[PDB]
Amino acid sequence: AFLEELRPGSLERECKEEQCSFEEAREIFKDAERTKLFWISYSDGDQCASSPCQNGGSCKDQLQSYICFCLPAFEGRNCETHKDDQLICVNENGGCEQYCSDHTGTKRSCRCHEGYSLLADGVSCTPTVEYPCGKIPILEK
Amino acid sequence: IVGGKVCPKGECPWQVLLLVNGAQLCGGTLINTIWVVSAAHCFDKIKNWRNLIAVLGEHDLSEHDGDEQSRRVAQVIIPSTYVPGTTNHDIALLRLHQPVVLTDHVVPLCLPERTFSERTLAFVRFSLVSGWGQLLDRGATALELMVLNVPRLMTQDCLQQSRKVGDSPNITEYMFCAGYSDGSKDSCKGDSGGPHATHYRGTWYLTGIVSWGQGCATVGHFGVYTRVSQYIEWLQKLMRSEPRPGVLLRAPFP
Amino acid sequence: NTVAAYNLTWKSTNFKTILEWEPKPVNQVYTVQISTKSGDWKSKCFYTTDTECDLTDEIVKDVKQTYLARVFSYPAEPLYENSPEFTPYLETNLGQPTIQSFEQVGTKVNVTVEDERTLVRRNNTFLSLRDVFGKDLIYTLYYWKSSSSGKKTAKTNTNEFLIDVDKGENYCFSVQAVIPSRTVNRKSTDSPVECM
Ligand SMILES: COc1cc(Nc2ncc(-c3ccccc3CN(C)C(=O)CN)o2)ccc1-c1cnco1
Ligand SMILES: *[C@H]1O[C@H](CO)[C@@H](O)[C@H](O)[C@H]1O
Ligand SMILES: *[C@@H]1O[C@@H](C)[C@@H](O)[C@@H](O)[C@@H]1O
Ligand SMILES: [Ca+2]
Ligand SMILES: [Ca+2]
Ligand SMILES: [Cl-]
Ligand SMILES: [Cl-]
Ligand SMILES: [Mg+2]
């Protein structure tokens, strides 16, 4: 509409509501340094529009990138890694105090060295002898 | 041990002092009431195989107290692949004639499962090394049990951080590096056979054995220990086998 | 059968920290470990096929510690490569700031900078850039009236600026986060421009 072009220059009308190119904003700002300062954040685009943060994470836009803020149970660039799916013997010994046995299909199972037995929590070990291996009695075993 | 501290009495309860004809020979580690793990090179020049003594509950070599127990060594088992005068396969499994009694001062160190040792214990940064060995390279030995905390290195890092000075034998898959290259802290001659013990979630385990000690704390070199996880299956099989007439037994490895 | 990873690089902004490396894996998986120079090694991104690993949960436990990471190559001692050392507090990029509001009181203008959230947590909530850096963090304001030739600058130890303006004139603003004690990577990118 040419009748809309009768209206005087405006950053809100031409650039906010509508789009606007480098020359349109340069005509408004006049200075090169001022137009470059506006254009670097304007022509950058919203990287968070593709909703890249998974599992209920929050997106924060950056210059040609973004940052995902994950909920406590998740991690990764896009919050894709579920912390619950990491219960394997190579990850902090599977939460076991002594031995860890990896089991495919079912979950991992913790075990104990001789002279110890597995506790109720399924991960801790307790001595079944007065002098179990690898404990120092003068420091109260 | 160079650069360490005195182990407070009873705080290294698995440490063994090996004597031959009453003389200080090597170190060792008690893994149960009957079996002791030591280094194969310790037995290189032994003539009197019936005169081997293991001492548990020792602390001060100049004073005897009620905490020390002595046992004759009935059998020394070394892998067949070990070649005297060299570094590889430096491990010995000793059978005591009679069991020791476990006390507040005499407690075995856990021998771990291979997998727990390889994927968990191998990534614990610091472990302890101990012995009555030389307090400096070519120096006099210690009268009280000394202990030293040392950081472990993966062999790639160890070789990249070392200088090929003096005797630099290959560091094989049956060895691991631990310590410092600045010449301040290491295990020395006389500490051979002793434990490299790792603390994990309230319990201590055997990870390494003090190998050759001569040349200890050389600037440009780290400490090199027998990688005990490679021998778990071998040690467990031999612990189930019956005794042989001779003291020395070269058993097949693997 | 495997290749050692190479070009290990830290990508970090507001403590969201990701280790990146080459190359794409063919019949090989990866495992990353992380440590402080005296702590134990912690395993991350187990048997991954990605060429990146998010290490945010490990580095936010102590942002002032110096970390070293290593990448292991397993076929579908192992082959591994060490990363450069990384100290979060000194090297994380400062995120792009946002002007929250501006208010006029006649001949004076208050310009408020929004609290920048970081990946550092303190029991349920995310800490802001000011909560972590405190006194080390300043904000810089670039302002100008549309009829003048040059720009002016104001600096603050908080998230607010209180400047003098000329009567009946429209001003444009942009803010930048700065950690003056740094020699390298001391500033964020400029915030989007805001005008009255
Ligand atoms: C193959 O290249 C090397 C190999 C080595 N080898 C080594 N260093 C030490 C020893 C050792 C091996 C067994 C037993 C006891 C000890 C040393 N020792 C007296 C102690 O550990 C006392 N606790 O071997 C060292 C350096 C290099 C090197 C340097 N730049 C590139 O490569
Ligand atoms: C949103 O889309 C993808 C993720 O789905 C991401 O790679 C882009 O960078 C982002 O703009
Ligand atoms: C952004 O942050 C994440 C962690 C979640 O709390 C979201 O609900 C929020 O919008
Ligand atoms: Ca953007
Ligand atoms: Ca004594
Ligand atoms: Cl006896
Ligand atoms: Cl802030
Ligand atoms: Mg226009």
Side-chain angles (χ1 to χ4, degrees), chain A residues 1-3 6-11 13 15-16 19-22 25-26 28-32 34-141, chain B, chain C residues 2-76 78-196:
Chain A
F2 73 91
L3 288 178
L6 261 63
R7 310 179 96 87
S10 166
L11 196 64
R13 203 203 334 282
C15 294
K16 265 79 189 192
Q19 187 69 22
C20 95
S21 64
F22 196 71
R26 205 217 55 84
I28 302 167
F29 291 107
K30 284 112 66 178
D31 191 36
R34 300 178 184 202
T35 317
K36 282 156 182 175
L37 197 55
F38 162 83
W39 204 253
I40 195 160
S41 266
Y42 193 74
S43 71
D44 198 77
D46 200 5
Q47 276 76 31
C48 295
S50 44
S51 299
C53 316
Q54 316 181 20
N55 298 282
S58 298
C59 201
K60 184 78 194 39
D61 202 36
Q62 302 293 316
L63 219 65
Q64 293 300 315
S65 46
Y66 59 92
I67 49 178
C68 287
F69 288 75
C70 306
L71 279 158
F74 307 93
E75 59 184 294
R77 188 191 293 272
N78 299 310
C79 305
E80 72 275 18
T81 307
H82 303 230
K83 294 180 192 171
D84 292 14
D85 305 342
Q86 320 299 313
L87 223 75
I88 53 179
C89 295
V90 299
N91 179 19
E92 292 293 286
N93 204 43
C96 304
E97 196 179 290
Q98 299 184 351
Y99 299 146
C100 183
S101 260
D102 267 322
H103 286 133
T104 186
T106 176
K107 77 143 68 154
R108 67 93 191 91
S109 62
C110 303
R111 289 170 301 110
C112 310
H113 186 103
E114 208 204 350
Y116 295 92
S117 67
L118 190 65
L119 283 191
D121 58 10
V123 301
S124 287
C125 296
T126 210
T128 68
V129 282
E130 183 183 19
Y131 291 113
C133 73
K135 272 171 166 40
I136 306 167
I138 69 141
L139 301 179
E140 315 314 277
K141 295 228 72 155
Chain B
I1 299 287
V2 185
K5 303 188 160 29
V6 169
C7 185
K9 181 171 165 58
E11 293 190 9
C12 299
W14 34 74
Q15 178 84 49
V16 184
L17 173 63
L18 293 172
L19 311 160
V20 68
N21 323 304
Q24 180 175 337
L25 173 72
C26 265
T29 311
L30 189 77
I31 64 177
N32 57 60
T33 55
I34 274 107
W35 299 91
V36 168
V37 172
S38 186
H41 85 259
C42 289
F43 309 90
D44 275 8
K45 271 113 186 287
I46 298 302
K47 313 285 114 194
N48 299 339
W49 288 95
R50 303 287 178 186
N51 296 350
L52 289 155
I53 290 299
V55 180
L56 265 304
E58 186 60 280
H59 173 71
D60 178 353
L61 307 190
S62 69
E63 290 292 320
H64 294 295
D65 58 34
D67 293 319
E68 302 148 41
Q69 307 175 40
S70 283
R71 296 303 187 264
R72 295 176 284 265
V73 173
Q75 185 154 69
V76 176
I77 311 171
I78 286 177
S80 280
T81 56
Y82 172 71
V83 169
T86 73
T87 51
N88 213 24
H89 298 293
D90 198 8
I91 185 166
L93 176 63
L94 282 63
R95 187 196 242 106
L96 298 186
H97 185 234
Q98 296 288 152
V100 293
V101 173
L102 306 189
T103 74
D104 279 13
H105 295 89
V106 176
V107 177
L109 184 67
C110 304
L111 178 71
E113 240 167 37
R114 182 173 201 144
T115 59
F116 171 65
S117 190
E118 291 180 338
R119 61 202 178 180
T120 297
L121 302 184
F123 301 111
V124 171
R125 182 82 74 158
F126 288 87
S127 292
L128 295 180
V129 300
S130 54
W132 294 275
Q134 306 181 353
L135 291 166
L136 297 162
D137 184 49
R138 283 272 174 194
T141 61
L143 278 167
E144 309 193 306
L145 188 60
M146 309 290 302
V147 65
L148 173 68
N149 207 12
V150 288
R152 181 161 179 175
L153 281 84
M154 214 125 165
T155 308
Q156 173 175 296
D157 291 313
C158 180
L159 297 176
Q160 291 171 357
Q161 290 177 221
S162 282
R163 280 174 54 203
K164 217 154 179 310
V165 296
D167 226 84
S168 304
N170 288 157
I171 299 173
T172 86
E173 54 263 57
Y174 300 102
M175 306 173 191
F176 75 84
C177 285
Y180 305 84
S181 56
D182 70 356
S184 66
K185 297 168 283 281
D186 194 14
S187 42
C188 300
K189 176 178 185 159
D191 301 319
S192 296
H196 168 288
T198 304
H199 202 200
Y200 186 74
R201 293 193 169 144
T203 303
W204 298 85
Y205 300 89
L206 184 64
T207 45
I209 296 154
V210 182
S211 183
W212 291 90
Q214 307 177 125
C216 75
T218 288
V219 171
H221 274 190
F222 289 90
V224 175
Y225 297 86
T226 304
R227 194 180 299 245
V228 176
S229 55
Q230 297 294 102
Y231 301 96
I232 306 299
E233 290 70 37
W234 183 84
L235 292 161
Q236 299 198 132
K237 178 157 198 194
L238 291 168
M239 273 180 52
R240 291 190 234 105
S241 73
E242 303 302 309
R244 245 66 150 239
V247 177
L248 171 75
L249 170 63
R250 294 175 62 240
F253 179 81
Chain C
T2 51
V3 284
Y6 60 109
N7 285 350
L8 273 60
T9 301
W10 293 96
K11 302 269 106 160
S12 185
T13 306
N14 282 17
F15 301 100
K16 180 81 187 200
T17 305
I18 296 172
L19 189 65
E20 294 192 345
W21 63 91
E22 292 177 55
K24 285 294 166 179
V26 175
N27 297 295
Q28 73 172 42
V29 293
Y30 290 117
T31 297
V32 181
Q33 288 183 333
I34 190 181
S35 74
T36 60
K37 41 256 146 293
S38 287
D40 302 329
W41 292 94
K42 322 224 155 287
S43 277
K44 303 293 294 189
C45 307
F46 319 93
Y47 307 122
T48 191
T49 54
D50 304 351
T51 60
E52 74 175 34
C53 181
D54 181 30
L55 296 164
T56 297
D57 286 313
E58 297 313 308
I59 71 96
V60 307
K61 291 172 170 169
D62 193 318
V63 298
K64 306 203 188 188
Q65 267 276 28
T66 293
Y67 299 85
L68 190 76
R70 62 189 179 193
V71 172
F72 289 83
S73 320
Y74 295 99
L79 311 194
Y80 74 99
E81 176 68 22
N82 291 329
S83 74
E85 298 209 318
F86 174 73
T87 309
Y89 195 91
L90 305 179
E91 293 173 274
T92 208
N93 295 315
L94 303 179
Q96 181 191 219
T98 299
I99 294 177
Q100 180 163 94
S101 63
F102 55 80
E103 213 215 19
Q104 204 162 32
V105 277
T107 180
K108 275 254 189 224
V109 179
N110 174 270
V111 172
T112 298
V113 168
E114 184 176 300
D115 307 326
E116 281 213 29
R117 295 299 158 189
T118 74
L119 278 285
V120 184
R121 313 177 109 129
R122 180 171 57 199
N123 301 95
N124 111 76
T125 203
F126 279 114
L127 300 186
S128 77
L129 212 51
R130 182 151 307 283
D131 289 338
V132 168
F133 289 96
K135 194 178 59 52
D136 292 0
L137 176 68
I138 73 161
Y139 284 94
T140 299
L141 177 64
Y142 300 95
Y143 65 109
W144 63 92
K145 67 207 282 287
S146 304
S147 70
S148 154
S149 175
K151 76 159 67 68
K152 292 165 255 70
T153 295
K155 307 212 181 151
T156 185
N157 279 322
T158 73
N159 286 69
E160 291 183 38
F161 303 91
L162 178 66
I163 61 169
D164 295 301
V165 290
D166 296 355
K167 304 102 232 140
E169 263 292 327
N170 290 289
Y171 279 83
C172 288
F173 311 111
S174 176
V175 302
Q176 199 176 35
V178 184
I179 304 302
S181 60
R182 295 179 166 191
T183 40
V184 176
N185 197 201
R186 57 201 297 271
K187 304 172 178 222
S188 71
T189 53
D190 305 84
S191 85
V193 173
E194 287 277 272
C195 311
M196 28 188 54

